[PDB]
Structure formats: C-alpha cells, structure tokens
A paper describes a structure:
Human CEACAM1 (hCEACAM1) is a single pass type I transmembrane protein expressed as 12 alternatively spliced isoforms that all contain an N-terminal V set fold of the immunoglobulin superfamily (IgV) ectodomain followed by up to three type 2 constant immunoglobulin (IgC2) ectodomains (A1, B, A2), a transmembrane sequence, and a signaling cytoplasmic domain. CEACAM1 function is triggered by intercellular or trans binding of the IgV domain, resulting in higher order surface CEACAM1 oligomerization and subsequent intracellular signal transduction. In contrast to other immunoreceptors such as the T cell inhibitory and mucin domain-containing protein 3 (TIM-3), programmed cell death protein 1 (PD-1), and programmed death-ligand 1 (PD-L1), CEACAM1 serves as its own primary ligand, owing to high affinity homophilic interactions of its unique IgV domain, as well as an important microbial receptor. The displaced CC′ loop forms a cleft with the FG loop that exposes the key residues F29, S32, Y34, V39, G41, Q44, Q89, I91, N97, and E99 critical in mediating homophilic CEACAM1 interactions.
Residue numbers in the entry:
A (entry chain B), B (entry chain A): 1 to 107
The structure:
C-alpha cells in the first residue's frame, strides 16, 4: 500500500527532512511530487522519469529539494513556508496512477 | 493552456457527452481521466498509454466510457448521478504534468 513518511515529523527551521516512500508498485514511468494534498500541476515540485534518471522541476520547486531513484524527497534549509502537506504521485506504464500524501511541521 | 469543453454541456438523461480536449502539450506519455475535481486514483475512470495505444479502466470506470487518442472522453447513457466534474491529467515525458477539469449537467 503506497505511503510516505517524514523524517523527522517535526523539523527545526533551517534544518532538513526526508520524505521516504514505501511500497512503490512495479512497472513505473516515473514520479511526481507536489506541494499540498493533491496532484496539482501549479503546485508541482519535481517530475522524475526513472529510465533516464532525469529530474525536472515544476512551478513549486525552490531549489532546496532532492529527489532519489526510490522516490524519496529530501528538502534542505527548511522554511516555515515548506510546512504541511506533500503529495507523491507514482505514474505506472498503464497510466493507472497512485497517490500518497504525507506531512511535516516546521517550527 | 490545457482545457476541456463538454459537448454538449447540457445533456438529456440517457444521451451522450464528449469531453473534448484543447491544447495538449508536447511529448507526452499518456492520459488519465477522473471523476471529480482532482487526480485521485480511487476515482480514476481510465488510463491511456499513448506509446502502446492502450486504455486500462480504473476503479471509477462504469463501462460507458471511451477514450480517444487525442484525450477526448465519451460518456454514453448518462444518468442523473453523472452531473458534475471530470478531470484529465496529461502525463508528460519529463513527468511534469498538467490537469484540466470540466463538467456537464444532466436533465
Ligand atoms: Ni439540474
């Protein structure tokens, strides 16, 4: 069952958090992470295509995010404006896609 | 900008609606249609793979839906329950995606 987890859940301003991804299904084109609680293009952070290991930023990219081959997202030098929810969308090769929403709190 | 237009917007019960698609982006991998206002997997009608030309039903498929290679969706035998919003997500090859949401009303 596709989920995320925030490491740590409570993040000091300036510090870092890892959004870790469990249970990626088989046969993927790629990954798409978003800010907020849904897949929304205006709030896309990064697109990652797995056969080419190419990452492409979206409208919400700050420059402080790093996406990994297993879908995990590290954000560095966390700001109060990074607080709350994020969404991962996993794109399957039949286009029947899966989403996972997680969150952390900046203090 | 990606848009959809319902043809016709106003549908008699038991008739047909074509959700047309304007301004597809470049270099894409496939399409995803959903019931409602968001790209939620649990409300996915259909995923269409442009590469292979293959449509896979999602969970919200009723057997009345037909997707065309240009992303337009046909809903046949419409009921009073179908009035509302429908969302396409177009999955691009750099996985940085776009959505557009339209609607129809059944009398
Ligand atoms: Ni009415």
């Amino acid at each position: 069952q596709l989920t995320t987890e925030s490491m740590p859940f409570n993040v000091a301003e300036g510090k870092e958090v890892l959004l870790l991804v469990h249970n990626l299904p088989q046969q993927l084109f790629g990954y798409s992470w978003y800010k907020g609680e849904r897949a929304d293009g205006n709030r896309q952070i990064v697109g990652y295509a797995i056969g080419t290991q190419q990452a492409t930023p979206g409208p919400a990219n700050s420059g402080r995010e790093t996406i990994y081959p297993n879908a995990s997202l590290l954000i560095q030098n966390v700001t109060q404006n990074d607080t709350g929810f994020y969404t991962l969308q996993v794109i399957k090769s039949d286009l029947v896609n899966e989403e996972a929403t997680g969150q952390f709190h900046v203090y």
